[PDB]
Amino acid sequence: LQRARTILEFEKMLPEWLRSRFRMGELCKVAEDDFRLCLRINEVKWTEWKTHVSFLNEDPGPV
Amino acid sequence: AAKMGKAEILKYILSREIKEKRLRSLSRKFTDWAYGPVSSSLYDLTNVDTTTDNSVLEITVYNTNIDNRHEMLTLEPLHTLLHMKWKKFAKHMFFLSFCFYFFYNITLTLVSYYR
Amino acid sequence: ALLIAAGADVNAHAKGAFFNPKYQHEGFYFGETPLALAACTNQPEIVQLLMEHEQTDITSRDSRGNNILHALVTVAEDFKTQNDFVKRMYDMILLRSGNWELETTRNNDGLTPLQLAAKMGKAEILKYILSREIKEKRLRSLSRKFTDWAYGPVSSSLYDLTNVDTTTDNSVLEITVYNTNIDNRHEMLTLEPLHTLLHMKWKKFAKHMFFLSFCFYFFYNITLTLVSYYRPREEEAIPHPLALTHKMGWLQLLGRMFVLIWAMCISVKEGIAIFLLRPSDLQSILSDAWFHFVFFIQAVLVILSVFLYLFAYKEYLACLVLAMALGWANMLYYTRGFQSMGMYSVMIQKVILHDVLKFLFVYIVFLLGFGVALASLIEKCPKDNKDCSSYGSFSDAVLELFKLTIGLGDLNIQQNSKYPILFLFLLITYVILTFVLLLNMLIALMGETVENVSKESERIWRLQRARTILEFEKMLPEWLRSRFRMGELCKVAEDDFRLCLRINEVKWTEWKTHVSFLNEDPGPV
Amino acid sequence: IQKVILHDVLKFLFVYIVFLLGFGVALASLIEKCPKDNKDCSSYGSFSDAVLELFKLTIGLGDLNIQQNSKYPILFLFLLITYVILTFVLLLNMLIALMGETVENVSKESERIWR
Ligand SMILES: CCCCCCCC/C=C/CCCCCCCC(=O)O[C@@H](COC(=O)CCCCCCCCCCCCCCC)COP(=O)([O-])OCC[N+](C)(C)C
Ligand SMILES: CCCCCCCC/C=C/CCCCCCCC(=O)O[C@@H](COC(=O)CCCCCCCCCCCCCCC)COP(=O)([O-])OCC[N+](C)(C)C
Ligand SMILES: CCCCCCCC/C=C/CCCCCCCC(=O)O[C@@H](COC(=O)CCCCCCCCCCCCCCC)COP(=O)([O-])OCC[N+](C)(C)C
Ligand SMILES: CCCCCCCC/C=C/CCCCCCCC(=O)O[C@@H](COC(=O)CCCCCCCCCCCCCCC)COP(=O)([O-])OCC[N+](C)(C)C
Ligand SMILES: CCCCCCCC/C=C/CCCCCCCC(=O)O[C@@H](COC(=O)CCCCCCCCCCCCCCC)COP(=O)([O-])OCC[N+](C)(C)C
Ligand SMILES: CCCCCCCC/C=C/CCCCCCCC(=O)O[C@@H](COC(=O)CCCCCCCCCCCCCCC)COP(=O)([O-])OCC[N+](C)(C)C
Ligand SMILES: CCCCCCCC/C=C/CCCCCCCC(=O)O[C@@H](COC(=O)CCCCCCCCCCCCCCC)COP(=O)([O-])OCC[N+](C)(C)C
Ligand SMILES: CCCCCCCC/C=C\CCCCCCCC(=O)O[C@@H](COC(=O)CCCCCCCCCCCCCCC)COP(=O)([O-])OCC[N+](C)(C)C
Ligand SMILES: CCCCCCCC/C=C\CCCCCCCC(=O)O[C@@H](COC(=O)CCCCCCCCCCCCCCC)COP(=O)([O-])OCC[N+](C)(C)C
Ligand SMILES: CCCCCCCC/C=C\CCCCCCCC(=O)O[C@@H](COC(=O)CCCCCCCCCCCCCCC)COP(=O)([O-])OCC[N+](C)(C)C
Ligand SMILES: CCCCCCCC/C=C\CCCCCCCC(=O)O[C@@H](COC(=O)CCCCCCCCCCCCCCC)COP(=O)([O-])OCC[N+](C)(C)C
Ligand SMILES: CCCCCCCC/C=C\CCCCCCCC(=O)O[C@@H](COC(=O)CCCCCCCCCCCCCCC)COP(=O)([O-])OCC[N+](C)(C)C
Ligand code: NA
Ligand code: NA
Ligand code: NA
Ligand code: NA
């Protein structure tokens, strides 16, 4: 929490051009004509197996 | 929800999955790909990151009226978002602020002690 | 089932980069084969169907050299993470095969599935293999645990020691003790065949060698002491200690020879030892090699002294005094023959790294900060009295503040300062931070350290002790290694003579009819 | 009282003495002969003298002068402060912490052992 306060106070100081390049997330197409900025996080889950029916890309892995 | 301190409702919204296609666009969590136990999720950052004026992240850190902030930054989209801001610019600035303030005190010392 | 019936290749090899990642969170490895995916994904019905198919090469290897059993060790995890299904797939595929071909196969790195499990740190899979019972006669030769005899609740088991004992190059025991890449070694030596195997090496040769290594190193320090403390201080010490000079005397001569030899002996040994493990990370040397450096340092400081005696400047004495103070404080190493003093030594190590170094750092920022602040106020002393103050300089103030913290000396507030109430303010401020808060806070944080570490100090002790036993064992010659060889040769099956380890047990809970055994006449002989 | 001696003190006293006598002879070995002008040039002039003075420091009694007619003063300070860190900072305070573990476990049985 204290560390988070330090990060944001630094972040409020940066200029506009330097704020843009360190912008977070990548632009993804989550639906039809719905381009949003999102955050990629990987997970590994072993317990409740299932058939993966809902997804965005059938070719897994990066790129 | 971030202001009044309702972590359970936040954890629902910030990681909402609607598996029902024909209502999948109403989600904020999206499974990009999954092969076996490995999966990759996408968390929307519309009004969570500080690109806007009053974001969820800014309320969480600066809300002095609640007493459960340190549970909120455990939530996955925020937690990962803090770690990345550190790796890129906040870590280096924290080292610089140290150095300027470190040599600042050494100068006060020596002009005084060797007056 | 349709695709296999239609002629689908049941021995494909998905060898792509996604199927051979380099960072877990880059992809998913399973062994590249359809049988391994069904096993690594908990699909027992498909795993059975593929084995029954007659072209399924269960003994197939992959790019990493891993067969079906190597891959299950790769994807296994602890019970809270997954479940016990990897252990159950491990059993199902091994029994259906019906031979030792799979567990004997070595990967490209030269490792069996048993050795691979000890390296990567999969205790649950080890505990299964190292104590495997197949009660089904017609598959009993595929076991590693054998019931020699049982009469009622008393039973006697035999544990195979094929590639567990150090008779071979890369054994399970050697991986367990020397694997600096994992963080659960002290759980591994709890497993019964290893645990009993450590205890017996101690009873036979490692205990006695530990007593001898003590004695040689004990008289080594006494000799360094007396040649130094009783040196010829007068004459400006031209006949330096450790000289091998004027005539003789049988204590003067014997002692000085034994030191310079044993000094080199550590330096070569620890010179080799420090080089082999090749310090990679920082947690290893502290947790596996700390006492190896101090003896390297202690030995080199002697030899550094033995050069500087008759060859160079007069700082030989400083190197010799460090050698003994280092030498005598090191003796906490040899506490580890005893459990009580050994566990006590483990806690000294932890409390320094968790509490003291945090403490000493913060204390010094105060000690030097308040020091220069208090020294900066002291006027020049009048020429009448030169000793007007004890804070007259930085080094003087830092020392006096140190004296206060340890409770030594006296404290006069009149120190020829320009601002006395301000002078008192910084002093009493220093007391509150140091005397009231930090010192007493240090005691409280130790209690938290002792509480958490007390539940693990016994098993960490046996780990350090295990390292001592094996290092002794690597020194012994061949003929002396053979007589202290472990296990007895037993006939566990037809034309299968193996070396095993006899351990007796008493079990009262789940009674049964003892049907599987080796000898119907119980008891020894 | 009976338990805490056998579980904590005898472990403690053993390790403390290996330091007390080891650092003692090391510090005594450095002290030159006193000039004939001042016979009492040092308090570490011998083994028994140094072992006593180090004992005094641990119990907080007396004074401490660093000028002791040594050949190597920074080296002389190094062994002394080293002795303080092991004894004053670590072992004494560590002893209190190990008692708390002894009191916790034994408190559940002291009544029945009393009877
Ligand atoms: C392209 C280069 C940069 C261009 C120029 C951009 C200039 C941006 C201007 C920033 C503000 C400048 C004025 C100082 C503000 C006053 C506050 C003060 O006294 O201390 C400041 C000193 O700490 C700093 O970090 C400031 C130094 C400049 C930041 C480094 C450049 C930007 C990040 C580069 C990326 C590196 C990674 C790159 C990786 C590829 C803040 O410290 P504090 O601790 O927050 O405040 C102290 C009080 N407190 C502790 C109570 C809170
Ligand atoms: C048959 C008699 C023997 C025949 C000859 C065989 C010669 C074998 C040769 C062994 C090595 C000899 C050279 C020394 C190695 C260099 C290292 C050193 O200086 O210290 C060594 C001294 O500790 C010892 O134990 C070595 C002394 C000889 C061992 C006793 C004979 C073998 C056991 C007899 C059977 C007994 C039971 C009998 C019951 C029936 C090792 O100590 P350390 O503590 O490991 O190392 C210090 C550093 N460390 C703390 C950081 C690790
Ligand atoms: C390790 C983690 C902790 C990090 C925190 C770092 C601290 C951060 C904050 C620091 C606060 C700032 C203080 C220093 C700046 C002012 C100094 C100055 O003005 O000049 C002095 C330079 O210093 C010396 O000459 C040193 C002499 C020895 C005394 C100090 C030793 C204490 C070390 C600690 C013990 C363990 C050390 C272990 C490592 C070696 C001049 O010295 P003087 O006295 O005027 O000498 C001449 C006069 N005389 C003839 C009377 C002698
Ligand atoms: C003891 C205090 C109470 C203890 C309780 C602790 C809690 C209170 C803590 C208080 C902190 C400091 C207390 C210092 C004590 C007095 C020292 C003093 O008077 O020194 C000298 C004055 O010199 C000074 O420096 C006077 C104090 C300056 C201001 C301190 C507070 C910061 C305000 C800054 C503004 C920013 C803040 C704005 C708001 C955001 C005089 O003293 P002397 O020389 O000994 O007197 C003899 C007379 N003689 C000179 C003729 C010889
Ligand atoms: C028990 C469990 C712990 C074991 C740890 C083992 C230790 C390991 C580490 C050991 C470090 C090595 C130190 C000893 C070797 C060097 C000595 C030397 O050079 O000669 C000295 C021999 O010693 C004496 O004469 C002793 C005199 C009394 C002082 C010591 C008593 C304190 C014992 C502890 C208290 C409790 C004892 C309880 C049991 C009795 C010469 O003495 P001196 O001073 O020159 O005397 C003559 C000069 N004078 C006229 C100035 C006086
Ligand atoms: C962490 C807190 C502390 C922890 C506790 C452990 C502390 C360990 C530390 C202990 C004390 C250390 C200092 C002792 C050495 C100084 C001796 C000395 O100079 O005085 C005398 C000699 O005395 C000897 O020669 C000493 C004999 C051995 C010690 C016997 C008592 C041991 C304790 C027993 C009780 C407990 C036993 C347990 C069961 C009850 C004479 O001195 P002098 O005449 O002035 O000058 C010398 C000249 N002369 C020799 C020529 C005459
Ligand atoms: C204080 C240190 C920092 C504290 C932080 C702790 C961390 C650092 C700990 C460091 C450990 C020891 C520090 C001793 C302090 C200096 C003492 C000194 O210089 O004494 C003397 C030199 O005599 C010596 O002995 C010099 C040091 C020898 C080497 C020590 C390290 C081992 C390296 C061995 C190789 C093996 C390893 C190889 C790699 C595997 C000189 O000092 P003096 O006489 O007082 O000066 C006055 C000048 N006069 C002589 C003209 C009168
Ligand atoms: C328990 C904790 C402490 C242990 C420390 C050891 C005990 C205390 C140690 C010593 C007694 C101190 C009193 C003075 C007598 C010294 C005699 C001597 O040999 O001196 C020579 C050194 O000799 C050597 O370096 C030879 C090395 C092997 C024998 C060492 C003797 C002790 C061994 C067994 C020790 C038992 C250990 C336990 C055994 C299992 C040189 O000195 P000196 O000039 O000839 O000496 C007379 C000087 N005087 C006339 C001024 C007095
Ligand atoms: C030549 C200089 C000699 C000076 C001293 C001579 C007099 C003798 C004085 C001291 C030696 C006696 C003390 C040790 C006692 C046994 C060990 C023990 O109790 O636990 C620990 C001691 O803790 C440390 O080692 C922490 C690091 C600083 C120690 C300072 C003293 C020695 C090094 C001086 C600096 C030199 C640096 C110079 C550059 C090389 C074991 O060490 P660790 O591995 O850190 O802990 C593992 C923790 N773990 C359980 C989580 C894994
Ligand atoms: C100078 C500083 C010296 C260095 C530190 C020395 C340490 C302090 C000294 C003693 C501490 C005593 C504490 C009580 C021990 C009980 C617990 C235990 O493990 O018992 C074992 C002791 O029996 C053995 O045979 C093992 C030890 C023998 C080798 C030690 C030689 C070197 C140390 C010699 C030192 C003596 C000279 C000391 C004075 C110089 C029982 O046997 P085991 O085979 O381990 O079986 C375990 C069974 N159990 C777990 C069910 C019980
Ligand atoms: C300064 C002046 C005096 C010198 C001080 C030197 C002091 C050192 C002297 C000598 C060396 C001893 C060092 C300490 C060893 C560890 C203790 C130990 O094992 O305690 C155990 C208690 O259970 C016991 O059985 C301990 C009793 C054995 C010793 C009896 C006294 C004899 C030694 C002389 C001492 C008495 C006479 C006093 C004077 C010497 C606790 O260990 P644990 O890990 O909990 O496990 C134990 C078994 N368990 C698993 C079943 C629970
Ligand atoms: C007065 C004269 C001497 C100066 C005194 C000043 C001393 C300070 C000097 C220097 C600055 C260091 C300050 C302390 C840092 C924090 C400690 C820390 O992280 O502890 C951690 C373990 O311990 C370590 O992680 C430290 C071990 C690595 C460093 C090895 C020693 C080198 C530094 C020099 C020191 C050795 C030589 C000694 C002499 C310098 C415990 O933290 P945790 O929260 O449990 O989490 C850890 C990770 N975990 C989550 C996996 C568990
Ligand atoms: Na005191
Ligand atoms: Na005191
Ligand atoms: Na006092
Ligand atoms: Na407690």
Side-chain angles (χ1 to χ4, degrees):
Chain A
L1 190 282
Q2 294 179 356
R3 183 177 181 269
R5 185 177 175 86
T6 302
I7 295 165
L8 295 175
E9 291 291 328
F10 291 162
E11 185 175 2
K12 291 181 186 294
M13 291 178 185
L14 298 174
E16 295 292 328
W17 62 270
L18 185 58
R19 185 182 296 274
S20 296
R21 66 180 66 253
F22 295 158
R23 183 178 61 75
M24 296 295 173
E26 66 277 17
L27 186 64
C28 293
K29 184 178 183 292
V30 298
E32 183 64 26
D33 294 331
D34 192 357
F35 293 99
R36 293 180 183 175
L37 281 170
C38 295
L39 182 63
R40 187 179 296 276
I41 296 168
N42 298 114
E43 293 179 354
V44 177
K45 185 177 183 294
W46 293 95
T47 60
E48 294 179 354
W49 295 99
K50 67 183 289 296
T51 302
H52 296 287
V53 297
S54 66
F55 62 90
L56 280 72
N57 290 318
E58 63 187 0
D59 293 331
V63 299
Chain B
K3 187 179 262 73
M4 292 179 72
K6 302 292 178 68
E8 293 179 354
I9 302 298
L10 292 173
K11 183 174 88 274
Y12 181 75
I13 300 166
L14 280 72
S15 66
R16 185 176 64 244
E17 291 180 353
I18 298 166
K19 299 291 183 183
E20 184 176 2
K21 182 266 290 180
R22 81 182 278 278
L23 292 175
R24 187 179 66 189
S25 178
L26 281 73
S27 297
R28 293 178 65 87
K29 181 171 181 185
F30 293 100
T31 302
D32 192 359
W33 61 266
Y35 182 78
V38 178
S39 66
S40 180
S41 296
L42 294 173
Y43 293 167
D44 191 0
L45 296 173
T46 303
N47 291 317
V48 177
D49 195 357
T50 60
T51 61
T52 60
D53 292 331
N54 193 1
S55 65
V56 176
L57 181 62
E58 185 173 0
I59 297 166
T60 301
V61 176
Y62 292 101
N63 188 359
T64 61
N65 296 115
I66 59 171
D67 59 356
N68 60 1
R69 292 178 293 173
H70 63 90
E71 290 82 357
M72 292 182 185
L73 297 173
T74 303
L75 278 72
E76 191 63 26
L78 297 173
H79 186 273
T80 302
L81 184 62
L82 275 302
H83 182 74
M84 291 177 72
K85 292 182 185 294
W86 183 257
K87 187 181 262 77
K88 293 184 178 65
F89 64 92
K91 182 176 89 274
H92 294 89
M93 293 175 73
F94 185 74
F95 181 76
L96 295 174
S97 181
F98 180 76
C99 295
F100 292 104
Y101 184 75
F102 182 74
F103 294 165
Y104 179 72
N105 289 318
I106 296 167
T107 307
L108 293 173
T109 303
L110 297 171
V111 301
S112 175
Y113 182 75
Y114 294 102
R115 66 177 65 87
Chain C
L2 294 175
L3 295 173
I4 297 166
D9 191 359
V10 297
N11 291 318
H13 294 89
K15 64 179 75 174
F18 181 77
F19 294 102
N20 297 113
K22 299 290 180 68
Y23 294 99
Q24 296 294 113
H25 75 68
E26 182 64 24
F28 182 70
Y29 180 76
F30 61 88
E32 299 180 354
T33 60
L35 182 63
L37 182 63
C40 295
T41 57
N42 194 1
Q43 292 176 357
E45 292 83 2
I46 297 167
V47 175
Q48 291 177 358
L49 183 63
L50 293 172
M51 292 185 291
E52 293 178 353
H53 189 270
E54 294 292 328
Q55 295 180 357
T56 302
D57 190 359
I58 297 167
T59 61
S60 66
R61 295 175 70 249
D62 62 354
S63 296
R64 292 181 183 178
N66 290 321
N67 63 5
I68 190 71
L69 298 180
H70 292 90
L72 294 173
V73 177
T74 302
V75 298
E77 294 298 330
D78 56 356
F79 182 77
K80 65 182 181 291
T81 303
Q82 291 173 356
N83 193 359
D84 61 355
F85 67 89
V86 177
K87 182 174 73 175
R88 292 185 290 112
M89 295 293 173
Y90 182 83
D91 183 74
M92 186 179 287
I93 297 166
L94 182 63
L95 295 173
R96 180 65 179 84
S97 179
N99 58 2
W100 292 95
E101 184 176 1
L102 283 71
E103 291 182 353
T104 303
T105 303
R106 293 179 67 188
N107 60 3
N108 288 320
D109 292 331
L111 296 172
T112 60
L114 180 62
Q115 294 177 354
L116 191 279
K119 187 179 262 73
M120 292 179 72
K122 302 292 178 68
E124 293 179 354
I125 302 298
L126 292 173
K127 183 174 88 274
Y128 181 75
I129 300 165
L130 280 72
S131 66
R132 185 176 64 244
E133 291 180 353
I134 298 166
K135 299 291 183 183
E136 184 176 1
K137 182 266 290 180
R138 81 182 278 278
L139 292 175
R140 187 179 66 189
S141 178
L142 281 73
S143 296
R144 293 178 65 87
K145 181 171 181 185
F146 293 100
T147 302
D148 192 359
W149 61 266
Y151 182 78
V154 178
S155 66
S156 180
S157 296
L158 294 173
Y159 293 167
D160 191 0
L161 296 173
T162 303
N163 291 317
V164 177
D165 195 357
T166 60
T167 61
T168 60
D169 292 331
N170 193 1
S171 65
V172 176
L173 181 62
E174 185 173 0
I175 297 166
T176 301
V177 176
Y178 293 101
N179 188 359
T180 61
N181 297 115
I182 59 171
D183 59 356
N184 60 1
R185 292 178 293 173
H186 63 90
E187 290 82 357
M188 292 182 185
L189 297 173
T190 303
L191 278 72
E192 191 63 26
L194 297 173
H195 186 273
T196 302
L197 184 62
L198 275 302
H199 182 74
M200 291 177 72
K201 292 182 185 294
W202 183 257
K203 187 181 262 77
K204 293 183 178 65
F205 64 92
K207 182 176 89 274
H208 294 89
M209 293 175 73
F210 185 74
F211 181 76
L212 295 174
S213 181
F214 180 76
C215 295
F216 292 104
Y217 184 75
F218 182 74
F219 294 165
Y220 179 72
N221 289 318
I222 296 167
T223 307
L224 293 173
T225 303
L226 297 171
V227 301
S228 175
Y229 182 75
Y230 294 102
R231 66 177 65 87
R233 292 180 181 177
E234 291 292 326
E235 203 265 328
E236 296 293 328
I238 303 298
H240 57 277
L242 280 173
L244 297 173
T245 55
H246 62 86
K247 190 182 262 74
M248 71 185 176
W250 182 64
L251 276 298
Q252 285 71 240
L253 187 32
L254 190 282
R256 292 182 179 87
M257 292 185 286
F258 182 76
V259 171
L260 183 62
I261 297 166
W262 185 260
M264 292 179 184
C265 293
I266 297 168
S267 179
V268 175
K269 183 260 181 68
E270 299 295 324
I272 295 164
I274 296 166
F275 182 76
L276 294 174
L277 76 163
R278 181 65 181 273
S280 296
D281 59 356
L282 183 61
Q283 293 180 357
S284 177
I285 59 169
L286 299 173
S287 300
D288 293 329
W290 182 256
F291 292 99
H292 291 81
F293 292 101
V294 298
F295 290 161
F296 182 74
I297 296 166
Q298 190 272 329
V300 172
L301 291 173
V302 177
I303 302 299
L304 277 173
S305 69
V306 174
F307 293 166
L308 295 174
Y309 290 162
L310 68 45
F311 182 76
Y313 294 100
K314 189 172 174 180
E315 291 83 3
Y316 64 91
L317 181 63
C319 295
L320 183 63
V321 175
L322 291 172
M324 65 182 74
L326 184 62
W328 290 103
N330 286 322
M331 296 298 290
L332 277 171
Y333 180 82
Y334 293 97
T335 57
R336 68 184 63 189
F338 296 99
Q339 184 177 1
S340 65
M341 295 298 293
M343 294 174 70
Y344 183 73
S345 179
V346 174
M347 191 68 76
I348 299 168
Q349 300 178 350
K350 298 288 182 72
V351 173
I352 296 163
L353 275 297
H354 294 288
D355 296 328
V356 175
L357 295 173
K358 295 182 175 67
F359 179 80
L360 296 174
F361 182 79
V362 177
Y363 180 77
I364 293 162
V365 300
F366 292 165
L367 179 64
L368 285 49
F370 291 100
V372 67
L374 282 170
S376 295
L377 282 165
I378 304 300
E379 294 180 353
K380 187 180 287 294
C381 297
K383 63 179 75 174
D384 292 330
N385 50 357
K386 184 259 181 68
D387 291 330
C388 76
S389 182
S390 66
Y391 295 167
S393 296
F394 181 72
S395 66
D396 291 330
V398 173
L399 182 64
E400 291 293 328
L401 294 173
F402 179 73
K403 290 174 70 64
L404 189 151
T405 302
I406 59 167
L408 276 296
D410 196 358
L411 182 65
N412 190 0
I413 59 169
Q414 293 179 356
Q415 296 291 321
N416 192 2
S417 178
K418 291 171 71 175
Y419 296 93
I421 303 299
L422 191 280
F423 181 80
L424 293 174
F425 181 79
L426 278 297
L427 183 63
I428 296 162
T429 303
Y430 180 76
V431 177
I432 296 167
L433 295 173
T434 59
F435 182 76
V436 177
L437 177 64
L438 291 175
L439 290 175
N440 293 318
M441 183 178 171
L442 180 62
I443 297 165
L445 278 169
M446 289 182 179
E448 183 64 27
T449 303
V450 173
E451 184 177 1
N452 291 318
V453 173
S454 296
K455 293 184 263 74
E456 293 179 353
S457 64
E458 185 176 1
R459 294 179 291 172
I460 296 167
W461 179 62
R462 293 180 184 275
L463 190 282
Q464 294 179 356
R465 183 177 181 269
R467 185 177 175 86
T468 302
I469 295 165
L470 295 175
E471 291 291 328
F472 291 162
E473 185 175 3
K474 291 181 186 294
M475 291 178 185
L476 298 174
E478 295 292 328
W479 62 270
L480 185 58
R481 185 182 296 274
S482 296
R483 66 180 66 253
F484 294 158
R485 183 178 61 75
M486 296 295 173
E488 66 277 17
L489 186 64
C490 293
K491 184 178 183 292
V492 298
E494 183 64 26
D495 294 331
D496 192 357
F497 293 99
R498 293 180 183 175
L499 281 170
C500 295
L501 182 63
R502 187 179 296 276
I503 297 168
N504 298 114
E505 293 179 354
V506 177
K507 185 177 183 294
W508 293 95
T509 60
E510 294 179 354
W511 295 98
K512 67 183 289 296
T513 302
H514 296 287
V515 297
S516 66
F517 62 90
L518 280 72
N519 290 318
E520 63 187 0
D521 293 331
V525 299
Chain D
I1 299 168
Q2 300 178 349
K3 298 288 182 72
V4 173
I5 296 163
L6 275 297
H7 294 288
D8 296 329
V9 175
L10 295 173
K11 295 182 175 67
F12 179 80
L13 296 174
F14 182 79
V15 177
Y16 179 77
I17 293 162
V18 300
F19 292 165
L20 179 64
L21 285 49
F23 291 100
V25 67
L27 282 170
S29 295
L30 282 165
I31 304 300
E32 294 180 353
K33 187 180 287 294
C34 297
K36 63 179 75 174
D37 292 330
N38 50 357
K39 184 259 181 67
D40 291 330
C41 76
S42 182
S43 66
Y44 295 167
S46 296
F47 181 72
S48 66
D49 291 330
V51 173
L52 182 64
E53 291 293 328
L54 294 173
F55 179 73
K56 290 173 70 64
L57 190 151
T58 302
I59 59 167
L61 276 296
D63 196 358
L64 182 65
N65 190 0
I66 59 169
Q67 293 179 356
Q68 296 291 321
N69 192 2
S70 178
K71 291 171 71 175
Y72 296 93
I74 303 299
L75 191 280
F76 181 79
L77 293 174
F78 181 80
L79 278 297
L80 183 62
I81 296 162
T82 303
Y83 180 76
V84 177
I85 296 167
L86 295 173
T87 59
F88 182 76
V89 177
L90 177 64
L91 291 175
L92 290 175
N93 292 318
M94 183 178 171
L95 180 62
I96 297 165
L98 278 169
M99 289 182 179
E101 183 64 27
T102 303
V103 173
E104 184 177 1
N105 291 318
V106 173
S107 296
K108 293 184 263 74
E109 293 179 353
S110 64
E111 185 176 1
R112 294 179 291 172
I113 296 167
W114 179 62
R115 293 180 184 275

